[PDB]
From a paper:
The sodium potassium ion channel (NaK) is a non­selective, monovalent cation channel that conducts both sodium and potassium ions equally efficiently. The SF of NaK (Thr-Val-Gly-Asp-Gly) differs by a single amino acid residue (Asp66) to the one found in potassium ion channels, yet NaK conducts both sodium and potassium ions. In a later study, it was found that the deletion of the first nineteen amino acid residues removed the interfacial helix of the protein, altering the conformation of the NaK channel and placing it in an ‘open’ form as the inner helices twist around a flexible glycine residue (Gly87). This deletion mutant is often named NaKΔ19.
Numbering used by the authors:
A (entry chain A), C (entry chain A): 21 to 110
B (entry chain B), D (entry chain B): 21 to 114
């Protein structure tokens, strides 16, 4: 399904960008930079980190508006695909 | 509603899995592991705890992407099939 | 509009219940108990408090499932009413 | 799209109001006040700061109820009117 495939690609690319940004500008380990990107765009949030640089705060504001809609579109399409085999078996 | 029953069971299994994961790998008490799993997948977040192990961080990323869709599908079906009909019935003057 | 009025009442009643619970079981000032109830059900979250009692953790789990749908229905209906005068003037 | 333009302006005014409020009453630097306003109204939350004054707590409660609806209305219109058409156009082989 192309719509799912394109949403996956867009999501991956968006998360790579955040991982690169937070590891190079905010000094996080790559796994922590990816984690922060994920919990930010899914709106879970993180209780133990917020960006410390003005550049990082501005980036994070724009990153949320650029990425939140795409990530929730991906989460929805992923849910359809993961749940369908159980629905159809049932 | 077969879809509701599926989302209910999958949500329960998802929360059981998180309870087992966070109590085993991150050392949380089971009630705290269940709490963390619920507030993470409903996107509330916990304001104090973050996974400390790299295993926990990777698991949580995958758990979020799969679990948010299931839990909010369940919450939507719960609203449509249970809560809204119950509110409507309870507003009828008798 | 009755649908808005009923959603308002349900939301108020739900927030009062949380305020009573967190102030009596978790020892919060009423304003902090109301604040915690609001940021929990809107999924904002709070970075500086989590329930400390097992009773409070169980309550919070059930409170989220009981209240999240109602609160977002109210937020949506509120948004229609607050935005409409500007839309119609424009 | 007149509705999009209205939601855009109202979102900007809402974020300006929060920036002014949190920098004045809660003592935050303006950039930190804007950051807090954005992560609160998108429901991400900030994992470190909570309003410390009772004024700030009451304001934040009201700001949340009014501002989440505006900001997510804007995000939805931004997705439908700007982001989706741009993605589609950028997928056309030329
Ligand atoms: K915190
Ligand atoms: K959230
Ligand atoms: K959150
Ligand atoms: Na949070
Ligand atoms: Na918390
Ligand atoms: Na944070």
């Amino acid at each position: 399904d192309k719509e799912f495939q394109v949403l996956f690609v867009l999501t991956i690319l968006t998360l790579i960008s955040g991982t690169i940004f937070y590891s190079t500008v905010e000094g996080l380990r790559p796994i922590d930079a990816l984690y922060f990107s994920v919990v930010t765009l899914t709106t879970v949030g993180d209780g133990n980190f917020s960006p410390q640089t003005d550049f990082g705060k501005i980036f994070t504001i724009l990153y949320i508006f650029i990425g939140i809609g795409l990530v929730f579109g991906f989460i929805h399409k992923l849910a359809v695909n993961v749940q369908l085999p159980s629905i159809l078996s049932n």
